[PDB]
Design a protein around this ligand. Structure first.
Ligand SMILES: [Zn+2]
Lengths: 80, 95, 97, 103, 64, 97, 78, 91, 105
DNA sequence: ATCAGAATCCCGGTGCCGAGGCCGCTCAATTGGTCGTAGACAGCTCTAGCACCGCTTAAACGCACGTACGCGCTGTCCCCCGCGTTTTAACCGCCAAGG
């Protein structure tokens, strides 16, 4: 519960600065939280489905790798 | 004369089931054939990845189920899984 | 004292965070949010840490790209202040509805 | 035919053949093509059902592809599925930004 | 105006005879040989006096 | 007499959202495509159905890219398009670096 | 050449897009982006036909090249 | 379960022979290599099934490398591949 | 030369790749020249990108390649960047994109 | 508002043409029968995922406060809409050099 509100405004600030964003409006943060949430929804749904067919109650890094390759947002680094 | 393929008569019958009083154009029938092609191809590719991320080479219906609910969005997918599962029961219950 | 009417703070920290390498969101609250989303489709699931680190990596990259195109939308808006419908236009063009 | 023995409409053995010649695995099970065929069957049923409603809208009897593109672009999950999909003689949503409507 | 002429020359590559087409553009002094069979193309400069036998001769020397 | 501007354009928007027939007619489009392919391979013929495929895909492609560009300009507190808008939309999609 | 694209053609492209008011440099910019688009498409299409060892590009190869750019188009047997 | 580590070491000593590497750099490299291998191989399988050819020779691999990588990389890769074909075919 | 790698004068195992093709469900049969050809392409790609890796790591007086080096070397390339457009590197970040509207003038 | 009048919609009409019925084939689905190992399953073992807490500390939160880009407004000036006027991308029939 409420770890969606565990997203801090200075973290959003830091992401904007590495993102290169200078000026920050105030109506941004919860919109950011909602987009991040829907993203992670689709991600973990697919990863857990890959683990559903895996017949193992633990999800691996490889699972999340394969699932994000399925979305085409494909990330290297951890093998897969 | 080389014999070419179509799926026109099958989905044609299905259309006649769901709408008896309805015509169709030929190009759209080809479009639906391409539609079946595309969906089948994405499913089969997910099946091959199911194989290689499971290190197995047998294909059963369980892999098809998990492939469909990997590809298709939720509510539509669960209805389709229901249709397929009831068909599995009706077929394999008999011969 | 040396209060400094602004400009060096933001851009200097941009220079620092682009000299940087590692993450920005710290670990535990992100992990707990992940498990709360995870507690919704199949209960009681266990995880290795590298999966979570990949999730954090791709999450921050996703948001970085959102911020970059949002920034260019703001620059085209002849403003430096961001807006929410900037992000909505960016995700409209990205086809991720 | 196994399709009739499954009480369905798509030919099983053609699909069983295409699974073999697709290099899709090494071996092929018994009823996996039945499940896949039923999936196809419900998909095309839903799609062309909305297409039939689209023809009901325009009061047309023969399906034009414009009906197909419209019925794709109306429903949510279907349009998120076929996002990267376009169709010849497709067209788009009849859509007007009302901020560009005059006053 | 360009001249599109069929000839009875043999293509130096595919060996099909009566399948070389010559397009002579005198406005820009550029002649073009084309094969109606294997689809190759050879370009060479032409004057005002040239004819399909002039560029086909230049094509024989461009190979050897 | 004279009509007041903007009206006829939107009326033909309502007209041109109806027929999905091809906008660019055939012969000049065919010449342009032929003059292009030639640059990749000389003496190349084209199946006319393939030409129609190229035509369809090109026109739908450009229409959708126009839609995103138009929404960019609507966000830009303006009504008229700009080339910089096309640059912004393409920079979001990622054709050019 | 590239100037076979008429102004009212790109205007009609705005109309089916639904775009109201048009600037100047739009036209040449449009022709350029269309050119690069067709360049990549027909390049890999002729690559397909190069492997085909045949002297006519198939509509099939056009379709598969569109798939290769993730631009899947139905309708013409694909 | 083999990674490609000493292969990378030998390529590296053939190019910048005074250069170290981290572990995770090697991991990203092998991720990269596997991605590229899978993309080319699947595209070659598409070549087979789109062309009804029951096996795959090197010509399919050449045209697939054309289909994936753009111009300069493609031409230099075709050159290197044909040179390897030449030297392996000679002996 | 007993080994085909020595018979190719290269650095990758070819029969590895041939077994990968066999244990791939890729084709039914696999010829003799295709695995050599593909492995040579792989070896060229490794050497080519590791060139930009070597220069990008040498930019900072560090003997070891870091992931930030790899992302920099990719984004400073043109062909590799359009290659890796949908691609993200772990521990990557992005380029210095300081807009001209931002510097104190 | 409010009328005149362009612009569009919408209703028989007919025509023509392809969708769909239809019909006689033949080749893959079937049917049945025969090896075989892949995997469903039982079970062993040790790792690692989890939970918990104590200590450290740097990181967030609230507020004080100016302040300065965002914005509503303004005037202005200009340059696209549009309607008008030619006008040129496509094909159709007697000349006056050949044979
Ligand atoms: Zn020739």
């Amino acid at each position: 519960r409420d770890n969606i509100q565990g997203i801090t405004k200075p973290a959003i600030r830091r992401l904007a600065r590495r993102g290169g964003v200078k000026r920050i409006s105030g109506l941004i943060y919860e919109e950011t939280r909602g987009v991040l949430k829907v993203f992670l929804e689709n991600v973990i749904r697919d990863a857990v489905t890959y683990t559903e067919h895996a017949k193992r109650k633990t999800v691996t890094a490889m699972d999340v790798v394969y699932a994000l390759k399925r979305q085409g947002r494909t990330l290297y680094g951890f093998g897969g | 004369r080389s014999r070419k393929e179509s799926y026109s008569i099958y989905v044609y019958k299905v259309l006649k089931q769901v709408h008896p009083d309805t015509g169709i154009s030929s190009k759209a029938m080809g479009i639906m054939n391409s539609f079946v092609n595309d969906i089948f191809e994405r499913i089969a590719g997910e099946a091959s990845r199911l194989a290689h991320y499971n290190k197995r080479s047998t294909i059963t219906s369980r892999e098809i189920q998990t492939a469909v609910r990997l590809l298709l969005p939720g509510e539509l997918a669960k209805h389709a899984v229901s249709e397929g599962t009831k068909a599995v029961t009706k077929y394999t219950s008999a011969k | 004292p040396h209060r400094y009417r602004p400009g060096t703070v933001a851009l200097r920290e941009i220079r620092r965070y682009q000299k940087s390498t590692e993450l920005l969101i710290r670990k535990l609250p992100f992990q707990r949010l992940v498990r709360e989303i995870a507690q919704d489709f199949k209960t009681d699931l266990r995880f290795q840490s590298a999966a979570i680190g990949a999730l954090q990596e791709a999450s921050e990259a996703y948001l970085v790209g959102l911020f970059e195109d949002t920034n260019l939308c703001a620059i085209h808006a002849k403003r430096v202040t961001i807006m929410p419908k900037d992000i909505q236009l960016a995700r409209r063009i990205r086809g991720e509805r | 035919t196994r399709s009739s023995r499954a009480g369905l409409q798509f030919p099983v053995g053609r699909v069983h053949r295409l699974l073999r010649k697709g290099n899709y695995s090494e071996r092929v099970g018994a009823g996996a093509p039945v499940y896949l065929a039923a999936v196809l069957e419900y998909l095309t049923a839903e799609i062309l059902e909305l297409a039939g409603n689209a023809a009901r809208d325009n009061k047309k009897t023969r399906i034009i592809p414009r009906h197909l593109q419209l019925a794709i672009r109306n429903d949510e999950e279907l349009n998120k599925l076929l996002g990267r999909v376009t169709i010849a003689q497709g067209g788009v949503l009849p859509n007007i930004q009302a901020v560009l409507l005059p006053k | 105006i360009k001249q599109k002429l069929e000839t009875q020359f043999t293509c130096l590559f595919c060996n099909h005879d009566n399948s070389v087409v010559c397009t002579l553009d005198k406005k820009n002094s550029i002649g073009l040989l084309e094969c109606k069979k294997c689809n190759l193309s050879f370009q060479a400069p032409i004057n005002s006096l040239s004819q399909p036998i002039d560029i086909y001769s230049d094509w024989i020397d461009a190979c050897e």
